């Protein structure tokens, strides 16, 4: 059961042959990310949505192995859903943080998911970072990914206590723009999600968005057939 | 009558608290042949009347040896005697291997007590139904323990177990004042034991085949005398 | 003992070799005898192997 190892020795033998930010503010937290995605130097997909939802008011964005961050984020979102149903209570962000870090700890860092978890709950707004080894730290603002240094530079230059919702969205999108401009991995659009302690989370897809066709019959058809299914 | 209802297992008490299933295992000792044990301060002696199933058969080995310091006597169920003897000798060995110390006789007895108690309280097994006499010599001197398969152990100067043990035990009760002083003259303690086991005999007499003896002491490792070696004491 | 004259007396095998100098005759529930004889044979061969 679990994640299989069943081709480890086989694949060994055969081998022998982004910017994310969270910004806490006076009544909530903003998380934002760029939407470029890359395979090697190649942009595999523009407009890739990097903001995952753990719960209605608990949202997530991650770096490292994308499939790992997705799988762990959806597992913890399932556990948070089930726990909320069991307790008939809106889930706590500290509960997501706990079970997410205990999961990543179980895999001793072999599941390479690094995450920023932001949310609001009955106890207020929360913003956390999680590392693939299972280490966490709280913050008022955070940045992650290859552009994490440029975004943190912006946050540290412009962040202040008691940002408003609009000022916090502006700051977050400025830090993502600085990533886009200064990091090669980041680019294309800015996604934003805004969680206010009293309010539904406001997701803002693409908050910022900073002929050769050949004539018919060009290609040499060899033969044709009908496939039906 | 009503005993029939509350006697099916070691796990039902009766309306009187009896726990009949343990009582039946204590009665299982009364089906055993008599054996006597006694000790002085310097030496300990066991005496046993062996039996054979038929005149074509050899006599069954009733006394054993945990090590060079302690030994054992059996009465009752042969399978349980086998189990407990193997257990007592695997404890004597493990003790020697790990600590290089002769297992104290009292400790060995307590280990038997513990092992025996378990079967009295779980449903599936059964009580061991066998009594044991343990003798040994250690730093604390000569020891004689009587084990009952209820999981009761008593250190005694002398005792008997088996079908007519009451006779030998009554005889010993009259004479304990004499045998406990028999220090450094073990031959007289052996002869006192053979006298004690000469009571409780019925239609039978002690013979080099049916009688077995063993002794241990300060100057004497555990030795068993049987066959022609017993003729010195008959 | 033979249930019927069609039973092959040459295959009743109430006596078996356990070892070169040890034999055994059965009586009773033959299945249990088979199990005991297989055990005894295994014991004998193991004792030979380990103690020469």
């Amino acid at each position: 059961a679990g994640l299989s190892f069943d081709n480890y020795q086989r694949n060994n033998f055969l081998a022998e042959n982004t910017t994310i930010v969270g910004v806490k503010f006076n009544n909530g937290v903003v998380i934002a990310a760029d939407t470029r995605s890359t395979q090697g130097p190649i942009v595999a997909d523009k407009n890739c949505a990097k903001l995952h939802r753990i719960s209605p008011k608990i949202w997530c964005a991650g770096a490292g192995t994308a499939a790992d961050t997705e799988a762990v984020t959806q597992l913890i979102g399932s556990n948070i859903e089930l726990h909320s149903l069991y307790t008939s209570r809106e889930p706590r962000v500290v509960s997501a943080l706990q079970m997410l870090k205990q999961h990543l700890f179980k895999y001793q860092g072999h599941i390479g998911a690094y995450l920023i978890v932001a949310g609001v709950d009955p106890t207020g707004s929360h913003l956390f970072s999680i590392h693939a080894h299972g280490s966490t730290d709280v913050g008022y603002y955070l940045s992650l990914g290859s552009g994490s240094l440029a975004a943190m530079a912006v946050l540290e230059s412009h962040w202040k206590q008691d940002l408003t919702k609009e000022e916090a969205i502006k700051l977050a999108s400025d830090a993502i723009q600085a990533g886009i401009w200064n990091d090669l991995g980041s680019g294309s659009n800015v996604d934003v999600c805004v969680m206010e302690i009293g309010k539904d989370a406001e997701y803002l897809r693409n908050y910022l968005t900073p002929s050769y066709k050949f004539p018919r019959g060009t290609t040499a058809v060899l033969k044709e057939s009908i496939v039906n299914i | 009558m009503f005993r029939n209802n509350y006697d099916g297992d070691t796990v039902t008490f009766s309306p009187t608290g009896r726990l009949f299933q343990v009582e039946y295992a204590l009665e299982a000792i009364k089906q055993g042949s008599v054996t006597v044990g006694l000790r002085s301060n310097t030496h300990a002696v066991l005496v046993a009347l062996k039996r054979n199933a038929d005149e074509l058969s050899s006599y069954q080995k009733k006394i054993i040896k945990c090590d060079e310091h302690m030994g054992l006597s059996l009465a009752g169920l042969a399978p349980d005697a086998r189990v407990l003897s193997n257990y007592l000798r695997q404890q004597c060995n493990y003790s020697s291997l790990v600590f290089n110390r002769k297992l104290a006789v009292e400790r060995a007895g307590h280990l038997l007590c513990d092992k025996a108690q378990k079967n009295t309280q779980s449903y599936g097994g059964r009580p061991y139904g066998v009594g044991l006499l343990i003798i040994g010599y250690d730093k604390s001197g000569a020891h004689l323990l009587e084990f009952q398969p209820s999981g009761n152990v008593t250190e005694l100067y002398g005792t008997a177990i088996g079908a007519r043990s009451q006779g030998a035990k009554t005889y010993l009760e009259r004479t304990l004042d004499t045998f406990i002083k028999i220090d450094g003259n073990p031959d007289e303690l052996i002869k006192a034991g053979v006298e004690a086991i000469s009571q409780s005999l019925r239609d039978e007499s002690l013979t080099v085949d049916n009688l077995s003896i063993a002794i241990v002491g300060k100057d004497t490792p555990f030795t068993i005398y049987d066959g022609e070696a017993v003729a010195k004491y008959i | 003992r033979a249930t019927s004259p069609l039973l092959e007396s040459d295959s009743i095998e109430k006596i078996v070799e356990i070892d070169r100098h040890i034999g055994c005759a059965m009586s009773g529930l033959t299945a249990d005898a088979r199990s005991m004889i297989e055990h005894a044979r295994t014991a004998a061969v193991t004792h030979n192997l380990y103690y020469d």
Partner: protein, 176 residues
């Protein structure tokens, strides 16, 4: 060698195309088509597995799997072997039977989903074909303009097969 090679899928109006340089590397599970590049042993194992899974799906649901659900099935089946993955680059293409939405997706060894709306390439010569598709591709191609675009791009990637998929019919074609 029959290991590796290249698969590409591409979207038109009310249609999709999927093509490969060819043993076979495009499979279909009802109206959802899966192209797989990589080790031919792993391609075959994935085909057998997804045939098993989609047959059980169709039996339990009395309904053919939709391309989005098949995409999630492929993603989760790849991640199951997170350690010692299949060395494969799968590509799914299809049209949702209810909405008629043309759909394509592609994956990494462990089932990250690209779900790009324009075109998806995998395998050998991926960056060459990325350049070709970016240059040649235009949105909302007609089915025959889409056929020309996909087939010419594939021929310029470096003996090929093309599927043109409508909601109600599929046309299979070959290229030298």
């Amino acid at each position: 060698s029959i290991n590796g090679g290249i698969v590409v899928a591409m979207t038109g109006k009310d249609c999709v195309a999927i093509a490969c340089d060819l043993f076979e590397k495009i499979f279909h599970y009802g109206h959802v088509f899966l192209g797989i590049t990589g080790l031919a042993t792993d391609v075959t194992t994935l085909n057998e597995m997804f045939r098993y899974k989609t047959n059980l799906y169709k039996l339990k649901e009395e309904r053919a799997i939709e391309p989005e659900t098949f995409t999630q099935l492929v993603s989760s089946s790849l991640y199951e072997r997170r350690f010692g993955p299949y060395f494969v680059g799968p590509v799914v293409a299809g049209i949702n039977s209810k909405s008629g939405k043309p759909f394509i997706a592609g994956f990494d060894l462990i089932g990250c989903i690209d779900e790009a709306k324009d075109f998806i390439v995998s395998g050998t010569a991926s960056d060459q074909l990325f350049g070709m598709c970016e240059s040649l591709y235009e949105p909302n191609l007609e089915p025959e303009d889409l056929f020309e675009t996909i087939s010419q791009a594939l021929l310029n990637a470096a003996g090929a097969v093309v599927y043109i998929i409508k909601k109600d019919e599929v046309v299979k074609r070959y290229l030298k």
